[PDB]
Amino acid sequence: YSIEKLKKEENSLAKDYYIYRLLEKNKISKKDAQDLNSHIFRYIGKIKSELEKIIPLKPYINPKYAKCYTYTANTILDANLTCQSVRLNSLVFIASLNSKDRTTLAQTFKNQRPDLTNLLLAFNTSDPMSYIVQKEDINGFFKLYNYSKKYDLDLNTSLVNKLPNHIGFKDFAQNIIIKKENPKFRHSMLEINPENVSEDSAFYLGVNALTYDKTELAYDFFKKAAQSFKSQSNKDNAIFWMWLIKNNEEDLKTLSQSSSLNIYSLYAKELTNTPFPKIESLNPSKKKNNFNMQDPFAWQKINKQIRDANASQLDVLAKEFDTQETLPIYAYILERKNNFKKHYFIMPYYDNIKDYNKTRQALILAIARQESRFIPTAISVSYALGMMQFMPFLANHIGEKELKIPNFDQDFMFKPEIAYYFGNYHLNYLESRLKSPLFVAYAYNGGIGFTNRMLARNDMFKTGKFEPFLSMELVPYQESRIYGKKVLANYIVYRHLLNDSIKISDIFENLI
Ligand SMILES: CC(=O)N[C@H]1[NH2+]C[C@H](C(=O)O)[C@H](O)[C@@H]1O
């Protein structure tokens, strides 16, 4: 596809992918590049670094404050008050000022902007965080945290209980707890009243409490999360923790009866001799329809229709895509049409994997379900490709260097045969070194590098009261933490459907 044919397609990640491929082959001239960010659906990361090597975008400072950005630290006292206040939005600018000028400006702004006064006079001390904490300036606290993570201080009960009301709190709490940073901040957050937090924040404050062996506090935080969380899957995770900590059989019972299929509800069902959840059976009789499952532009279009459709239109689309050839689209539509209440675990292009053993089949299918929902031309924001969502680098390494395939192109990852084949190959590499399917899952999403480093630590996937469940909450990247939980449920399910059951309790034992 030339840049001309692409310009005639709707903006989408598919079209971004293809523009990025031209850019990486140096086929975009400085003239082609003029109109080009109007042709880019998501102007972020690699495609933007690459376009900026050709046309280094100058903007953006706002026409209204242009004059304000002509001053420096040495001339800011000659700026009008509006300009003084705008420039003082940057803590780096504040840190750059000399101390006499911070004193002057602190007085100028006392009455009208005490927030600026506080930051100014704080940077006149050897510890700005300590000054801000003493004023209980909550906006200033978060501005300082975002300027530098290195500040760490004990916070009293009054202060920590004010932090949850600021939008910054959730990412702050998660980040320092998951990363095991800012120990004084962490310890201080034991005194947050569960009444003052909810959802993810409450959940992470329970994980925090467990790391200090404050099991009562933890229960209280987990219970608040269970009550406040929107998603049933997240409630179940919280209810599991309530059960593990205080051992109330009504918690486990409630969890065994969840409509969400996840590792926590699966596990609770197995502990209470409850039958395995019902898995829908999708068996369309029509073989084919018009739709090209190998056209990535067709997918991007129909996906947008599906996601924007009223209850009525979903039904017209359900009927149209009720074919074997478009089975992954059928399932995708049915998932949105039943408001995410039924369990779909399809097995498309099955011929390509039926000769592998059943455990490997289940892992492949588990990964595919999470990566793409089996959409052959799926493209991520990082331009990972096909059902098994291969990064192009790896796809080219395997296809050209290892398997010496004639005329290999990375777009071969859009072929099911190739996606499953490469997925098998890469899963052998990972499972050979890692063994557990949970660990394989982590390494598949976030690299074997990061997985090996996490498993090398003496406080991750070792023996303990609350292991391996606690470790699964402390996986340092949120995306990988979530990916692994989901892939593991998928694996259990597919093993079951393939008559190769395994007890999830055995999986958990093999994590220690
Ligand atoms: C096996 C494989 O290619 N893993 C990759 N899958 C897509 C991910 C993404 O962030 O989109 C990563 O590139 C991951 O390493």
Work out the burial of residue 25: count CB atoms within 10 Å of its CB; fewer than 13 is exposed, 13-18 middle, 19 or more buried. exposed
- Smallest CA-to-CA distance from 269 within 236, 293, 245, 300 is with 236
**SS3 assignment, position 379:** strand
CA distance 367 to 387: 9
Query: Which two tokens mark 204?
Result: 């992470």
Site to substitute for ligand 1 among 382, 420, 478, 482, most atoms within 8 A of C-beta: 382
Contact assessment for residue 76 and residue 97, using Cβ atoms and an 8 Å cutoff: yes
| Ligand 1 centre distance from Cα of residue 454 (Å) | 18
Atom 3, ligand 1: residue with shortest CA distance = 390
Q: How many CB atoms lie within 10 A of CB 90?
A: 12
Q: By the 8 A CB rule, do 441 and 488 touch?
A: yes
Question: What separation in angstroms does the CA of 431 have from each of 76, 304, 402, 415, 467?
Answer: 60, 36, 18, 24, 22
- CB of 146 shorter than 6 A to ligand 1: no
Substitution candidate for ligand 1 out of 445, 477, 478 with most atoms within 8 A of CB: 445
Contacts of the segment 66-75: beta carbons below 8 A, 24+ positions apart? 73/97, 73/98, 73/101
Residue 385 DSSP SS3: strand
Residue 148 near ligand 1, beta carbon < 6 Å:
no
- CB-based burial, 168-188: b 16+ in 10 Å, e otherwise: ebbebbbbbbbeeebeebbeb
Distance CA 208, CA 185 (A): 11
Q: How far is the CA of 381 from the centre of ligand 1 (A)?
A: 11
DSSP state of 306: H
How close is the Cα of 232 to the center of ligand 1, in Å?
27
Query: How many Å apart are CA 281 and CA 301, to the nearest integer?
Result: 27
C-alpha to C-alpha distance for 283 and 302, rounded to whole angstroms: 22
Using CA atoms, how far residue 274 sits from 250, 258, 337, 502, in Å, is 14, 11, 28, 15
Report whether 350 contacts 334 (CB < 8 A).
no
CA–CA dist 471, 461 (Å, integer): 6
99: enclosing H helix or E strand: helix 99-109
Estimate to the nearest angstrom the gap between the alpha carbon of 476 and the chain centroid: 12
- How many C-beta atoms surround the C-beta of residue 151 within 10 A? 18
Closest of 96, 71, 81 to residue 119, by C-alpha: 96
Query: What is the DSSP track for 154-221?
Result: ---HHHHHHGGGSTTHHHHHHHHHHHT--HHHHHHGGG--GGG--HHHHHHHHHHHHHTT-HHHHHHH
| Probe target for ligand 1 pocket from 20, 371, 390, with the most ligand atoms within 8 Å of CB | 390
Amino acid sitting at position 31: K
* Helix 448-456 and helix 416-434, axial crossing angle in degrees, nearest 10: 20
Report in angstroms the alpha-carbon separations of 206 from 80, 214, 229, 458: 49, 9, 14, 22
Contact residues for 316 (Cβ-Cβ < 8 A; gap 6+):
none
Q: Is 382 in the pocket of ligand 1 (CB under 6 A)?
A: yes
* CA of residue 385 to ligand 1 center, whole Å: 9
Resolution (A): 2.4
Atom number of ligand 1 nearest to Cα 382: 11
CA of 397 to the centre of ligand 1 (A): 14
- Residue 36 phi/psi, 5-degree rounding, is -90, -30
Element (H, E) at 479: helix 478-497
Residue 231 is which amino acid? S
What is the rounded distance in angstroms from the CA atom of residue 203 to the CA atom of residue 230? 13
- Tell me the CA end-to-end span of the chain in Å, nearest whole number: 50
Q: Report cis status (omega within 30 of 0) of the bond before 60.
A: yes
CA dist., res. 70 & res. 66, Å (int): 7
Q: Other CB atoms closer than 10 Å to residue 93's CB: what's the count? A: 15
Task: Tell me if 2 CB under 6 Å of ligand 1.
Answer: no
Q: How far apart are CA 204 and CA 210, in angstroms?
A: 10
Neighbour count for residue 309 (Cβ, 10 Å): 17
- What does the DSSP 8-state code read for residue 390? B
Amino acid at position 190, single letter:
L
Give the CA-trace dihedral at 451, 454, 458, 460, to 10 degrees: -90
Atom of ligand 1 nearest to the CA of 394: 3
The Cα–Cα gap between 194 and 499 comes to 44
One DSSP character per residue, 245-289 reads HH--HHHHHHHHT-SS-SHHHHHHHHHTTPPPPP------S----
**Distances from the Cα of 249 to the Cα of 86, 239, 244, 246, angstroms:** 58, 11, 10, 9
Reading the block at residue 493, the tokens are: 């399910």
Cis peptide leading into residue 183 (ω within 30°): no
Question: Is residue 389 in contact with ligand 1, taking CB distance under 6 Å?
Answer: yes
- Between the CA of 260 and the centroid of ligand 1 the distance, in Å, is 26
Alpha-carbon distance 478 to 203, whole Å?
14
Which token pair is 240?
């599991």
d(CA 329, CA 181): 43
Residues 6+ away with beta carbon under 8 Å from 184? 152, 153, 154, 155
Residue 241: CB partners within 8 Å, gap ≥ 6?
206, 218, 219, 222, 469
The amino acid that residue 439 corresponds to is F
Please name the residue that has the structure tokens 């493209």. Answer: 379
Please tell me the residue having the least CA distance from ligand 1 atom 10: 382
List all residues 6 or more positions away from 122 whose beta carbon is below 8 Å from its beta carbon: 128, 129, 131, 132, 140, 144
Are residues 321 and 288 in contact, defined by beta-carbon separation less than 8 angstroms?
A: no
Instruction: Determine the atom of ligand 1 nearest the C-alpha atom of 380.
Output: 11
CA distances for 503 relative to 293, 371, 462, 465, 473, angstroms:
36, 24, 20, 21, 21
* Any atom of ligand 1 within 6 Å of the Cβ of 231: no
Tell whether ligand 1 has an atom less than 6 A from the beta carbon of residue 384. yes
Residue 320, Cβ neighbours under 10 Å: how many?
A: 16
Dihedrals phi, psi of 379, to nearest 5 degrees? -135, 120
Say if residues 436 and 510 touch (Cβ distance below 8 Å).
yes
* Residue of 391, 413, 430, 477 to mutate, ligand 1, most atoms within 8 A of C-beta: 391
Q: What angle do CA 178, 183, 185 make, to 5 degrees?
A: 90
Q: Does the beta carbon of 390 sit less than 6 angstroms from any atom of ligand 1?
A: yes
Q: Do 274 and 492 meet the contact criterion of CB atoms below 8 Å apart? A: no
Domain that holds residue 468: 350-511
What sign has the CA pseudo-torsion 371, 373, 379, 380? Answer: negative
The answer, yes or no, to whether any atom of ligand 1 lies below 6 A from the CB of 479, is no
DSSP string, 310-377: -HHHHHHHHHHT-SSTTHHHHHHHHHHHTTT-S-----TTGGGTTTS-HHHHHHHHHHHHHHHTT-TT
Answer yes or no: is the C-beta of 98 below 6 A from any ligand 1 atom.
no
- Decide whether any atom of ligand 1 lies within 6 Å of the 447 Cβ: yes
Contact 218, 210 (CB under 8 A): yes
Task: Tell me, using a 6 A CB cutoff, whether residue 426 lines ligand 1.
Answer: yes
Q: Verify whether ligand 1 is closer than 6 Å to residue 168 (CB atom).
A: no
